[PDB]
């Protein structure tokens, strides 16, 4: 084994900045990216902190489709990324890079990536040591007839180097299930049980009609655990909005996929927040986002979602390491071995951890994320392990995985209940994780939490996440209900009809709007309540190192009742919030 280019692991989580090539201005003779950022613009931008937590993902987008177009490009930015200088302190400082390599089946029809060799690829890695690793993402829709050799190689020509495959994939076809052998296809398999370390697997939830999120993270984490892959991540893809037809917010009526530019920019900033924890909450620690304009930013500035929401996630988790592979093992108690494709895919889990067939959120973590992997794959190397001999590794053929009664009839032995209530809540040690999960309804949710005696009950409007976790002289507090109004993309429309028949915003419109009306003249929303209430304590308490998104929050409102030992909190606010409550139990 070579060394390392860069270490990727709880401690040392991925947020992957990606810089998606614009392919007509390339035609004019000009190296730019969709949305105006720049490669020396926006890694100057990324916080100091955040800077060896991130890399710098270039994607070809719509680079002409020939030979040399996507080398060309690259080449010029990857010289940029090797020569770049740090103004602070003057040294040359190379900024870490991953290129996007394979998408849409490199068809010559569909990407500039398709004239990418392997040849060429092994040396850029040669050249340039700033070159962490390569980008495979999206091709479930298009399965193209050597993608499992070519995925080999790419690993192959990774480890060669010490740089990373990643590949975002969605189980859409059989995709995950394919790609370890499922069809006879097993090249790739070969080399994993080779190179595996040197492979992240993440998910790609932008295919979401077809429901399959619940069963590809549950692969994800499964191939994790199963040394199968070295980590894991998810690449959550604000496109969903558009692939489920789903327009202006709690508004009826569907409008298919017929609004695109409008529909990617729908999707509330925390539910994002809410769908990363899926990933962090089971040991997860690469995160990548779609679409870039909306989740990152334009012109080199972090858009809203990006600085109230996914910042402020990313940075938690880097301050939370999350749960190690040894401690996820410790806590699993069944593990699936089998294919999800042959069980009704999403269907599998739908009234057992989700809600609904097409959603990236649980309404339970009372089983968190039941691992799992194709059937084409061993349990050989998970059995291997010293942690994982208090997990049962059940066929997903099983009787016990039949029915949604069966499984939950069966997980339920094996889970116990651990809180009350409608609302999604799961607990990492000292921690509650609560957020409401509702997609589009606009519903409030309830649920009592305890830590040992001490309880607490929450009541969260949708689009809310809260992290609760018991400290030494009382309880920090982390909130985000973050949520924007995004009432003006669906002006002139009083129906899906008419909503549907809108003119396009275009995506060149869809950029012009967020420079226009988002990174600046932004319509907040309105700050809305959140309640908290605790059960089990001695004095009114006290509430210390309040901070959150400037203007979008009241004071905390603390109602004690020395009769009942009990506090009431009232929140008013649309943003990220934190606080600390201090105070005794009774
Ligand atoms: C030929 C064709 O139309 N293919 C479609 C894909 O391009 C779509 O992928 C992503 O989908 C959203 C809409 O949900 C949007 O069109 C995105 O541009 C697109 O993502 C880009 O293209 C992919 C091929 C990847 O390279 C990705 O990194 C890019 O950002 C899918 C959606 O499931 O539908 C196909 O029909
Ligand atoms: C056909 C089409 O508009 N494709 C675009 C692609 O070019 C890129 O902008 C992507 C980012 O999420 O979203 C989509």
Redesign the pocket.
């Known amino acids: 084994e070579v060394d390392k280019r860069r270490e990727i692991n709880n401690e040392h989580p991925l947020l992957m900045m990606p810089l998606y090539a614009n392919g007509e201005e390339f035609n004019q003779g000009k190296y730019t990216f969709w949305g105006g950022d720049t490669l020396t613009g926006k890694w100057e931008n990324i916080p100091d902190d955040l800077k060896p937590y991130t890399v710098i993902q270039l ?1 070809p987008d719509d680079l002409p489709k020939r030979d040399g177009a996507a080398r060309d490009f690259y080449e010029h930015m990857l010289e940029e990324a090797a020569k770049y200088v740090n103004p602070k302190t003057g040294k040359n400082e190379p900024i870490p890079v991953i290129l996007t390599v394979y ?2 089946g490199n068809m010559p029809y ?1 990407t500039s990536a398709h004239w990418l060799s392997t040849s060429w690829i092994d040396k850029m890695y040669q050249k340039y040591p700033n070159l962490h690793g390569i980008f495979s ?2 091709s479930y ?1 298009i399965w193209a007839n050597d993608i499992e050799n070519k995925a080999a190689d790419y690993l192959k020509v990774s480890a060669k180097n010490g740089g990373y495959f990643i590949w975002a994939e969605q189980n859409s076809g059989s995709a995950i299930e394919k790609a370890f052998g499922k069809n006879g296809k097993i090249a790739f398999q070969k080399s994993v049980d080779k190179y595996w370390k040197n492979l992240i697997f993440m998910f790609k939830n ?2 979401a009609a077809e429901g399959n999120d619940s069963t590809t993270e549950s692969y994800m984490k499964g191939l994790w655990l199963s040394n199968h892959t070295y980590q894991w991540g998810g690449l959550m893809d604000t ?1 969903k909005w ?2 489920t037809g789903k327009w202006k917010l709690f508004a009826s009526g569907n409008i298919g996929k017929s609004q ?1 530019d409008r529909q990617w920019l729908t999707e509330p900033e925390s539910m994002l927040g809410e769908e990363a924890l899926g990933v962090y909450l089971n040991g997860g620690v690469v995160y990548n986002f ?1 679409h870039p304009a909306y989740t990152y930013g334009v012109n080199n500035k972090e858009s809203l979602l990006f600085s109230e929401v996914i910042k402020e996630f990313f940075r938690y988790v880097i301050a939370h390491p999350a749960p190690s592979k040894e401690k996820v093992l410790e806590d699993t108690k069944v593990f699936i071995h089998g294919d999800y494709s042959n069980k009704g895919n999403g269907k599998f889990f739908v009234n057992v951890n989700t809600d609904r067939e097409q959603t990236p959120l649980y309404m339970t973590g009372r089983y968190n994320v039941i691992p799992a992997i194709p059937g084409v794959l061993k349990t050989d190397k998970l059995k291997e392990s010293v942690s994982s001999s208090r997990i049962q590794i059940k066929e997903i053929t099983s009787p016990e995985f039949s029915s949604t009664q069966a499984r939950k009839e069966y997980l339920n032995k094996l889970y116990p209940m651990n809180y009350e209530g409608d609302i999604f809540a799961q607990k990492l040690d000292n921690r509650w994780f609560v957020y409401n999960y509702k997609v589009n309804e606009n519903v409030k949710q309830t649920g009592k939490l305890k830590f040992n005696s001490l309880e607490m009950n929450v009541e969260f409007e949708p689009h809310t996440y809260g992290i609760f976790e018991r400290i030494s002289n009382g309880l920090k507090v982390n909130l985000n209900n973050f949520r924007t109004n995004k009432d003006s993309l669906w002006s002139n429309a009083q129906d899906a009809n008419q909503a549907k028949k809108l003119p396009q915003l275009t995506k060149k419109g869809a950029i012009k709007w967020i420079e226009e009306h988002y990174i600046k003249d932004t319509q907040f929303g309105e700050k809305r309540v959140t309640k908290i209430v605790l059960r089990g304590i001695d004095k009114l308490p006290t509430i210390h190192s309040l901070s959150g998104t400037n203007n979008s929050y009241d004071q905390p409102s603390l109602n004690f009742d020395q009769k009942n030992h009990m506090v009431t909190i009232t929140i008013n606010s649309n943003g990220n919030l934190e606080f600390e409550l201090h105070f005794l139990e009774h």
């Open positions: 994607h998408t849409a569909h993402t999206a829709w932008t295919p496109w558009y692939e695109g779609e």
